[PDB]
Design a binder for these strands. Structure first.
Length: 73
RNA sequence: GCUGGCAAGCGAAUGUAAAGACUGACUAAGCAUGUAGUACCGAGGAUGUAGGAAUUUCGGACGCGGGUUCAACUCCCGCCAGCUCCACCA
């Protein structure tokens, strides 16, 4: 369910909705399986309607053995 | 506007205020063509056919690139990231 145990133990969630996000082929096809690292995503104000911040990309072996796919994307 | 013919005082009754045509040097004050102005807008008028607001969506991304069914998000190919099989003795 990806409950975000940090945000569960601290400052219980109050409001949420449902929406997707935009990403490239590198950082995709693993979220379909479920692996990810979304613990305490630091989403801050962005001019483009608060672009997703904080959470990185899953460390699954989809790497081109240079980087995972994108250290910062 | 000073004057202009005089009644009215020099501080009195108290003023009509049009301003266009016509000659020409025209390239306004050498020098191209003139008798009303083609300029300049900015709150004076209009475009609203198309680009800006909503509104149907085209655009995108499942690795990329493109010649492919467009319904592509693997319908045809070259690579690269792993598995396997061997070729591979100057």
């Amino acid at each position: 369910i990806a409950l975000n145990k940090r945000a569960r133990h601290e400052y219980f969630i109050e409001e949420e909705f449902e929406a997707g996000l935009a990403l490239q082929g590198w950082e995709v096809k693993s979220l379909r399986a479920g692996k990810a690292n979304i613990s305490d995503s630091y989403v801050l104000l962005r001019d483009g309607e608060a672009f997703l911040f904080g959470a990185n990309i899953t460390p699954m072996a989809v790497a081109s053995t240079h980087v995972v796919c994108d250290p910062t994307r």
